[PDB]
Design a protein around this nucleic acid. Structure first.
Ligand SMILES: [Mg+2]
Ligand SMILES: [Mg+2]
Ligand SMILES: [Mg+2]
Ligand SMILES: [Mg+2]
Ligand SMILES: [Mg+2]
Ligand SMILES: [Mg+2]
Ligand SMILES: [Mg+2]
Ligand SMILES: [Mg+2]
Ligand SMILES: [Mg+2]
Ligand SMILES: [Mg+2]
Ligand SMILES: [Mg+2]
Ligand SMILES: [Mg+2]
Ligand SMILES: [Mg+2]
Ligand SMILES: [Mg+2]
Ligand SMILES: [Mg+2]
Ligand SMILES: [Mg+2]
Ligand SMILES: [Mg+2]
Ligand SMILES: [Mg+2]
Ligand SMILES: [Mg+2]
Ligand SMILES: [Mg+2]
Ligand SMILES: [Mg+2]
Ligand SMILES: [Mg+2]
Ligand SMILES: [Mg+2]
Ligand SMILES: [Mg+2]
Ligand SMILES: [Mg+2]
Ligand SMILES: [Mg+2]
Ligand SMILES: [Mg+2]
Ligand SMILES: [Mg+2]
Ligand SMILES: [Mg+2]
Ligand SMILES: [Mg+2]
Ligand SMILES: [Mg+2]
Ligand SMILES: [Mg+2]
Ligand SMILES: [Mg+2]
Ligand SMILES: [Mg+2]
Ligand SMILES: [Mg+2]
Ligand SMILES: [Mg+2]
Ligand SMILES: [Mg+2]
Ligand SMILES: [Mg+2]
Ligand SMILES: [Mg+2]
Ligand SMILES: [Mg+2]
Ligand SMILES: [Mg+2]
Lengths: 59, 118, 211, 150
RNA sequence: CGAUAGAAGAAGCUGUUGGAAAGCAGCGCGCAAAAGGGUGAUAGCCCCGUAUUUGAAAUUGUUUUCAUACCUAGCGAGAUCCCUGAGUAGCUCGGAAAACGUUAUUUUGAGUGAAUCUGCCCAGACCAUUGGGUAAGCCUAAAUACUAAUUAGUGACCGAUAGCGAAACAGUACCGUGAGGGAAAGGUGAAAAGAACCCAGAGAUGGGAGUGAAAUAGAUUCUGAAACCAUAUGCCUACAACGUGUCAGAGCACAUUAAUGUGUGAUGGCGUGCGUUUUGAAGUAUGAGCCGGCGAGUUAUGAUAGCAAGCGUUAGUUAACCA
RNA sequence: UUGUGGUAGACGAGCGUUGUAUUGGAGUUGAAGUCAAAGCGUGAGCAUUGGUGGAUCCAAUACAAGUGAGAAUGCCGGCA
């Protein structure tokens, strides 16, 4: 099996197996979002349980 | 390792054929029709065990009802008198008495007729 | 334990040999033994079974009949699996492995327990070079030896460290008994023996191998 | 155990094999567990991993991570940790002594780094390319010493 | 040292069932031979062989020794002179090779075009420092890839629908103008001793006789299943509405894996098949004329999880390869 | 004591076929096959006897599968 080249470059793993990710809606069209929204989307997050199983076998 | 089927299919097929012995023509010759008839016959046998339990009760009730009408009493009141007198006897044995032992069956009807309940 | 020598005449030596306690193990492992026997039984498979799949069988890659308007059913080839010509769907292949892996320490533990249970028991006598060369290479002498030792029906196994030739010249026409070097005996050869004759220096090599 | 009676440990060898084609009595007949007439019941299989039926998959929806050192490899380091080095038995920890203890391979030239905070009782004499300030503080709080090779 | 024919090569009788002993039993014997095949059943000692020791006139393979051609040889000094692969390396315009979808490196269809050890190329655009290497000339064993064929052998491979399409005279019969497509079919008995002769018949053939242990082993030739077609003991059936059965039930006829037995079923109650796919099928939806054989969750390489075993806190475990 | 209708489906426990490895056993005084019968099991299934048949087969514990046929307007052969 080959690791998907798109699964990597977008999902980093951690010590306990959580898959770190970046928030979307942070590429353009900045004036259409509030500074609260922008500063909340700047921080990183983890995949939800609904996607953890699908990303585990993808990596 | 090429395992080849022989004596496995034939034995389990001949069991079904043996069960469907005494059927009409192909229903005992061909394995397929024999298997269908055995399953259907098993269903019939299952249903008729239950239906036998009910039908024989009905026949005993009919015979007992008739035996009472010759003496002027009805089935609906005979069972009520039986309950009030605490007498507990199957309608089967009661019908067997009325067919085999007329004198003793008449003795039971005489006691339930008039004697004080309990 | 009391491991005692055997002479050529079948009589026992009056001097028993003491045994170091490292050979015998108070703890016995049976699962590693079972796995060792299974992997010995495996790798004995030649695995030369081969079958022709649907594409490999010589036949016509054309449609026999048209797809529609014929009273017959749809068919795509004359060498399909459900055809008498015969295309075997899966079939045995000559690329199967049949091999299994067992850890080195697990094999050592299996060998340790099997030596422990086979040793310090009946028909586990000690043997030397004298009767290994007193055989003279004639199997009649060895038949007499087994008859005297009452090991005729037993599957006696000779464990040898120096590959004596007179002993190997005999015991070769005997389908029952056999002789092996210490680096050649395995778990299965050890517990099929039902009886074995072990050389004293073989026994010395055994404590060393176990470590 | 003999060869005529050989047994595995219970619940180790044999487990219930799910045979998918042999009759309905096993609960795995006819359909064989695929369901009923849909894509997952055909011979093809279960589509592609990560597919969402045409909707943009999760990875295609999220931004890509950035690699600052493009085309480079992180410099690997051999790290000696203080919480476990106490369990190891040796004094005057240099590269050669680690080779004899086989913590490091003799065919490796990676620089040695010292890491850790856990207090150690006996003194050790390290020969490390890099050492933390507080790891050095712990080592020198005991009667040990550390020399920084260059 | 082998290859292409070969020579020698040990060890058993008696009795019993049996057509026949080699089986079985008693008493023995040989083995560097207990691999195998045949011999009237299942033979270490009946035969051929096998282990082992050997042998080539002639052709041919490998290796070694000797001689003999051919090639093959070091370290300094001075001179400051000469040579070191040109339409070549670069560069431009279109393509490509490399993991790369053209880009440092390699290559080229069109055009242009250098320098000469203080020289030229390279170290992912490029420049400088440092370092590495000597393009535009050629040849190169070994480890590597494969088996139509020859010899020996093996198989938890197949055993006439299987195994090569082809166990038989198979790429045949046959189909097509042609390329091309492409079958089925094995077994008497130890030994033909293959049935002389008689009877019926025109004859094949059949019934006896004869051979044979067996002829219901007879050339239709090992065993002979079901569907299918006929014959017969016993029971029932010509006023009867039937998914053909089931539960009760007389009478009739027998006697068993001895069992409140078996075969048939006048009559009474109840009763619209099996798979598929559907909200819903007795179905005026679908699939099967019947019987028998074949016919669909595997293998290789990895990942996760459950269970179990080995080894354990500077642990655990090898891959290729060698024996 | 509470329970035991059941499709898709999940889980657990077993039967049967062929072969291999260890043990033991039967067989021309008749093995497999094959037919019949008024047997034994909760189920896959398993025996006993007799006829035919003429040489291999069975039991236990493990292992490996071309391992289970009623349907595919399924293929082949035979017969309605
Ligand atoms: Mg079948
Ligand atoms: Mg084939
Ligand atoms: Mg189910
Ligand atoms: Mg499923
Ligand atoms: Mg659907
Ligand atoms: Mg379907
Ligand atoms: Mg579905
Ligand atoms: Mg869309
Ligand atoms: Mg000779
Ligand atoms: Mg001879
Ligand atoms: Mg023989
Ligand atoms: Mg360049
Ligand atoms: Mg390319
Ligand atoms: Mg230079
Ligand atoms: Mg650079
Ligand atoms: Mg040059
Ligand atoms: Mg064929
Ligand atoms: Mg045939
Ligand atoms: Mg022609
Ligand atoms: Mg005749
Ligand atoms: Mg015929
Ligand atoms: Mg015949
Ligand atoms: Mg009438
Ligand atoms: Mg009328
Ligand atoms: Mg009506
Ligand atoms: Mg009616
Ligand atoms: Mg009726
Ligand atoms: Mg009706
Ligand atoms: Mg079905
Ligand atoms: Mg529909
Ligand atoms: Mg509809
Ligand atoms: Mg209708
Ligand atoms: Mg229609
Ligand atoms: Mg349809
Ligand atoms: Mg139809
Ligand atoms: Mg059929
Ligand atoms: Mg696991
Ligand atoms: Mg249930
Ligand atoms: Mg078996
Ligand atoms: Mg028989
Ligand atoms: Mg199959």
């Amino acid at each position: 099996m080959k690791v998907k080249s798109a699964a990597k470059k977008r999902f980093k793993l951690t010590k306990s197996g959580q898959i770190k990710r970046k928030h979307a809606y942070t590429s353009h069209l900045a004036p259409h979002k509030t500074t609260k929204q922008k500063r909340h989307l700047r921080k990183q997050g983890t995949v939800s349980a609904s996607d953890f199983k699908r990303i585990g076998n993808l990596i | 390792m090429r395992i080849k089927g022989g004596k496995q299919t034939r034995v389990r097929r001949k069991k079904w054929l043996k069960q469907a012995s005494g059927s009409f023509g192909t229903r005992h010759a061909s394995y397929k029709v024999a298997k269908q008839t055995v399953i259907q016959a098993a269903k019939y046998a299952y249903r008729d065990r239950r239906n036998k339990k009910r039908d024989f009760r009905s026949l005993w009730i009919l015979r007992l009802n008739a035996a009472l009408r010759e003496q002027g009493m009805t089935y609906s009141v005979f069972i009520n008198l039986l309950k009030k007198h605490n007498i507990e006897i199957n309608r089967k044995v009661l019908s067997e008495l009325a067919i085999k032992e007329p004198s003793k069956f008449n003795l039971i009807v005489q006691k339930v007729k008039s004697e004080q309940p309990k | 334990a009391k491991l005692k020598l055997i002479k050529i005449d079948g009589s026992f030596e009056t001097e028993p040999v003491k045994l170091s306690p490292g050979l015998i193990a108070k703890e016995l492992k049976q699962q590693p033994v079972f796995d060792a026997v299974l992997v010995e039984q495996a790798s004995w498979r030649q695995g030369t079974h081969s079958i022709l799949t649907k594409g490999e069988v010589r036949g016509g890659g054309k449609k026999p009949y048209k797809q529609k308007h014929t009273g017959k059913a749809r068919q795509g080839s004359t060498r399909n699996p459900h055809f008498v010509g015969g295309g075997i769907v899966f079939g045995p292949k000559p690329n199967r492995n049949y091999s299994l892996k067992l850890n080195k320490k697990a094999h050592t533990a299996a060998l340790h327990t099997v030596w422990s249970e086979k040793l310090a028991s009946d028909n586990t006598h000690l043997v030397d070079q004298n009767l290994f060369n007193k055989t003279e290479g004639k199997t009649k002498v060895m038949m007499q030896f087994l008859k005297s030792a009452k090991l005729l029906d037993k599957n006696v196994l000779f464990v040898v460290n120096t590959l004596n030739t007179n002993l190997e010249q005999s015991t070769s026409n005997i389908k029952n008994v056999q002789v092996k070097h210490l680096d050649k005996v395995s778990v299965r050869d050890l517990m099929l023996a039902n009886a074995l004759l072990v050389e004293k220096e073989v026994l010395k090599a055994l404590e060393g191998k176990f470590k | 155990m003999e060869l005529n009676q050989l047994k595995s440990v219970p619940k180790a060898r044999n487990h219930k094999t799910k045979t998918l084609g042999r009759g309905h009595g096993s609960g795995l007949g006819k359909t064989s567990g695929r369901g009923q007439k849909g894509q997952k019941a055909r011979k093809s299989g279960l589509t592609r991993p990560g597919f969402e039926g045409g909707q943009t998959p999760l990875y295609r929806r999220l931004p890509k991570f950035g690699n600052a050192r493009k085309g480079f490899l992180k410099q690997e380091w051999v790290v000696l940790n203080l919480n476990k080095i106490a369990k190891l038995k040796l004094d005057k920890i240099n590269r050669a002594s680690l080779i004899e203890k086989q913590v490091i391979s003799a065919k490796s030239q990676l620089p040695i780094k010292l890491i850790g905070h856990t207090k150690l009782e006996k003194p050790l004499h390290f020969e490390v390319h890099k050492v933390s300030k507080q790891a050095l503080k712990a080592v020198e709080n005991a009667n040990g010493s550390v020399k920084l090779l260059e």
